[PDB]
């Protein structure tokens, strides 16, 4: 059955170039088009260009001309995309998609490759306890995870036994460094009478921090 397997996530410096592979399996590679689609988190789907291995033909999006360069190897059935002067705004997931003949532009999609363009160096997070100002059924606590690169970060509460009523919020770019907050809602009979701790894991900086949420 039809298979499109993509290169794997890339973390590249700005200006530098990147190459994403797309391996095809389960059909005659030279009989079909291979398209490339950009998906920037806030912009929807965007066609970059096509390649047709049959006669090496390429057609590009105006937006992407001289930004994307599409090649393919016939013997490995592997399509490649190279992008050149990487901007912060080239941070997206990128898909390769093959068509159905006389049917549709995109029939089978690759799993996607995440490209993240940033000049930042590996940064350990700062974890700050968020304890309530007021007094007393339910009581919300929090953990602020601030100024770290790269994503991803892992937030648990009470080593993970506290999992109901937890919200971990999508990170935000706060001046080239990521920051997020995680909240937990517990019975007022449990905190402040009990050790409530958020455990923050950051694999890239190889760090583990525990923060006892204590009253101010």
């Amino acid at each position: 059955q039809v298979q499109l397997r993509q290169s794997g996530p890339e973390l590249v410096k700005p200006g530098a170039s990147v190459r994403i592979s797309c391996k095809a399996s389960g059909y005659t590679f030279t009989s079909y088009y291979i398209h490339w689609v950009k998906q920037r988190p806030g912009q929807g789907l965007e066609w970059i260009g096509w390649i047709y291995p049959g006669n090496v033909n390429t057609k590009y999006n105006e937006k992407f001309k001289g930004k994307a360069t599409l090649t393919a190897d016939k013997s490995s059935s592997t399509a490649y995309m190279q992008l050149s002067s990487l901007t912060s705004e080239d941070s997206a997931v990128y898909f390769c998609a093959r068509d159905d003949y006389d049917g549709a532009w995109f029939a089978y999609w690759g799993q996607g490759t995440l490209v993240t363009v940033s000049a930042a160096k590996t940064t350990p997070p700062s974890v700050y306890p968020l304890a309530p100002g007021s007094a007393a059924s339910m009581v919300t606590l929090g953990c602020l995870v601030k100024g770290y690169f790269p994503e991803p970060v892992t937030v648990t509460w009470n080593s993970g036994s506290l999992s109901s009523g937890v919200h971990t919020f999508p990170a935000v770019l706060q001046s080239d460094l990521y920051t997020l907050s995680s909240s937990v809602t517990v019975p007022s009979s449990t905190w402040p009478s009990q050790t409530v701790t958020c455990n923050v894991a950051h694999p890239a900086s190889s760090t583990k921090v525990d923060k006892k949420i204590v009253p101010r």
Binding site: Y128, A131, G133, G142, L144, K146, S181
Partner: peptide, 21 residues
């Protein structure tokens, strides 16, 4: 709605993030 004063841990290092869930 829950509002949180900056941790004196952040404060004492010169920064102050007020958080609201």
């Amino acid at each position: 709605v829950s509002i949180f004063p900056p941790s004196s841990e952040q404060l004492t290092s010169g920064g102050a993030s007020v958080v609201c869930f």
